[PDB]
């Protein structure tokens, strides 16, 4: 019943490797005229989707051989013979016959060597404290894989409230990821404690990376 399902949700592949993106429809999607309008589109961060494959296996003017589209009936596949760094982004299959439907998309991430993040912590600025607020920022830059955990500690105790994180898209140049976690408290609660901590646990280590600062220093 129209559902266009894609797998995997996220596909990690080192440069030069092969990539297989699957797309299944819940019903036979062949048009009464005999043709099968299944298309594939690619969309990189902050850009408009691009056409790669139409009618299942046909490539669009300007798309390299490395891209293959196969399948029929209810199953279709997209293959990237030799993944480049410029291939990362999200791939969507699209059924173009009546009641056009997009698949969920398959994020193509480029695999590189594991890299531990570089953590940096920053106390509130005098200007903010003057405003009555108190933000403590912590940057965890250029790490891989993305799977990362940040835990805040005010005088040893974990704090989950007022914590906001944001992540960058895999860097097109070095394929690393970066994250920024921000613990926000009012100035008064900020000044009733002394040691603020930022902890990051990442696949690259057992002993997590800890960066702190004492208000009394």
């Amino acid at each position: 019943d129209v559902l266009m399902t894609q797998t995997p949700l996220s596909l990690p592949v080192s440069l030069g490797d092969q990539a297989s993106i699957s797309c299944r429809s819940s019903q036979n999607i062949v048009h009464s005229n005999g043709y099968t309008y299944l298309e594939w589109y690619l969309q990189k961060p902050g850009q408009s989707p691009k056409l790669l494959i139409y009618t299942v296996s046909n490539r669009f003017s300007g798309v390299p051989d490395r891209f293959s589209g196969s399948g029929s009936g209810t199953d279709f596949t997209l293959k990237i013979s030799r993944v480049e760094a410029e291939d990362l982004g999200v791939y969507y299959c699209f059924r173009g016959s009546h009641v056009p439907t997009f698949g969920g998309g398959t994020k193509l991430e480029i695999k590189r060597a594991d890299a531990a993040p570089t953590v940096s912590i920053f106390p509130p600025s005098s200007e903010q404290l003057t405003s009555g607020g108190a933000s403590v920022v912590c940057f965890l830059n250029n790490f891989y894989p993305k799977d990362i955990n940040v835990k805040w500690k005010i005088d040893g105790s974990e704090r989950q409230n007022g914590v906001l994180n944001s992540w960058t898209d895999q860097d097109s140049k070095d394929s690393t990821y970066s994250m920024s976690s921000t613990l926000t408290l009012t100035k008064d609660e900020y000044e009733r404690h002394n040691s603020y901590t930022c902890e990051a646990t990442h696949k690259t280590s057992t002993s997590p990376i800890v960066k702190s600062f004492n208000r009394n220093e």
Partner: protein
Amino acid sequence: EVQLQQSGTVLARPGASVKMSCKASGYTFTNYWMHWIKQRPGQGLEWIGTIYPGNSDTTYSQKFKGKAKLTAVTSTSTAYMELSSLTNEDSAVYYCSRRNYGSSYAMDYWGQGTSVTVSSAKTTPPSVYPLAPGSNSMVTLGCLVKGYFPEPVTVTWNSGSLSSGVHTFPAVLQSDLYTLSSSVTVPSSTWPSETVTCNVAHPASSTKVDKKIVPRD
């Protein structure tokens, strides 16, 4: 040479309705079907509906009947999508694209996309805070842009000279208010020896602030 230019970013209030346009050129506007696609932030594409500018023929995805209203104006080679009874769920980028037949059978050309934000919060300049390290060969500095609305915002370091080693994180929702941060890494012999400044430009409130990163102790 075929290109679709779409109207600019829009901020609307719940219950309101907005109308966007898709100006086409490069082909015979009235011969091809023009499609519309929605994309919630951090989400996949979704087919909205289509219209045949030739004779104002339309088709909508059941999900968009009464929500979207498509029209085209032959003489101006312009397609329009009007969204009514807006809610947060309609906040997204909307693309228009031409479906070609012959050389290819798909959506080969897309618009740059129109951004729509549904919210009942007014323009608010951002407060910019310097993130200096408390107390290595490289050193990381930062800039905290907090409490602004709506998107977007421009952040550069030193008018732009400092480009590499920068990580401006995605804006996060802070209760009807947006918040992002930017980090930059430079040589120890460069800073604090030489001052570093972040520039924050908030379009919506025509605000431009320059913040120096002053060391501490």
